[PDB]
A paper describes a structure:
The APCDD1 ECD consists of two closely apposed β-barrel domains (ABD1 and ABD2). ABD2 contains a large hydrophobic pocket that accommodates a bound lipid. Collectively, the results of this study suggest that APCDD1 serves as a negative feedback regulator of WNT signaling by neutralizing WNT ligands.
Fitting this model to the electron density map of eMBP-APCDD1 provided the starting point for iteratively solving the structure of the APCDD1 half of the fusion protein. This structure is observed in all three crystal forms (eight unique APCDD1 structures), with a global rmsd of 0.7 to 1.1 Å among structures.
Residue numbers in the entry: 50 to 467
The structure:
Amino acid sequence: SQCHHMLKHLHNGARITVQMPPTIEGHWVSTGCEVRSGPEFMTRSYRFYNNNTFKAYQFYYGSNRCTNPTYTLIIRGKIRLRQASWIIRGGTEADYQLHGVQVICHTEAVAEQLSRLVNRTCPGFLAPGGPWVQDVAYDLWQEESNHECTKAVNFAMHELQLIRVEKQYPHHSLDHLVEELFLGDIHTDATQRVFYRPSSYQPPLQNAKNHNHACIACRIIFRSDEHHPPILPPKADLTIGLHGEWVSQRCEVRPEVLFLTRHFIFHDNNNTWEGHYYHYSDPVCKHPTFTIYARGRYSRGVLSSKVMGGTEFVFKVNHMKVTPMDAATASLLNVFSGNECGAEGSWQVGIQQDVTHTNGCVALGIKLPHTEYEIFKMEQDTRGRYLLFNGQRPSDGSSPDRPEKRATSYQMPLVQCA
Ligand SMILES: *[C@@H]1O[C@H](CO)[C@@H](O)[C@H](O)[C@H]1NC(C)=O
Ligand SMILES: *[C@@H]1O[C@H](CO)[C@@H](O)[C@H](O)[C@H]1NC(C)=O
Ligand SMILES: *[C@@H]1O[C@H](CO)[C@@H](O)[C@H](O)[C@H]1NC(C)=O
Ligand SMILES: [Cl-]
């Protein structure tokens, strides 16, 4: 349970086998109320058939608890697995074709808002005297009319272009197999979604044959359909008391910067925080590259009016240290810290060093102090362990350096370790 042990044995010490190319045939379902940027509160129910065809449900909701369905998208098409990604090691690229996008509204208020918005976005879509009514499926992608209005909901299915299936087993055994389908991540800027080729992953979907059995959401979503959306349990929101230590549960993938694990320490006495960011080149986080240590201060919590269930925080980084973890990294840091700004840093593999030099010249152009506007939430897993979520990093590689760039979605959770 110690933070170091949990960072050495990610995901409860489970062993993963990745079959490349993956087998995606089956019914894949969400494990909870997912948050896409927006915010968009949703769950997924994806069927991939042996005919390389697909039926995907996207159930949307009005709240972070996924208890009041608003509208549901039924997406049909075909998928074609291509070659293994060279951008994201462990991922397989795929190509897809959409063949239909249907929408069903679940309340009369949503039926009215959506029909009006689609008509505003695509002036001719709707006939003169016929507003949408609830519980009726409506074609948003009318194919053979060459007229579509997926732009009204800023819809894109590019998540299907990056695919990874992990077979997870607790202990070195072939028992209690959980199959997880990772699909491409969703851009944090909804306008850029139709242009975004995924470079990381959404939260994993679980297989209907090989799912965690304590996952109540999984069963609710398995048995759902477009007319009976999954009603998730009305769990109460927990109050964020940023305290203790937290570590990554998985080897996380971030766009362009490769793979990583995190260790956070919060000091509720003086509202100070520390973070370790262990960077790796491999999708199993066994081949390290460099490590970053950050320390600073954080503000008090304010409940968000933009993301239900979120608590807004302001974080300030005052001090930062870097540890090279391979010869290439130490060499690069030595070449730049010396041949340009500064004189000597003697970067060494495994040796931590501050990036603010005594003369105040920071290496690689880092700007300290740095302020980030964060969003946090705390949940519990099926074993009751607390989980800490912070804001999804902006997809372009930018930092949430202004309040208007604060995330409306979250990263993969950290789990409490002390
Ligand atoms: C593919 O065959 C499956 C049965 O394996 C069927 O359910 C599905 O309708 C077919 N393709 C389409 C249109 O999704
Ligand atoms: C919009 O919808 C109304 C009501 O359904 C309909 O009368 C009208 O023709 C539509 N057209 C435009 C341009 O919005
Ligand atoms: C805050 O308190 C912690 C002890 O919990 C201590 O390690 C740290 O140095 C303190 N920071 C400041 C700025 O006082
Ligand atoms: Cl972070």
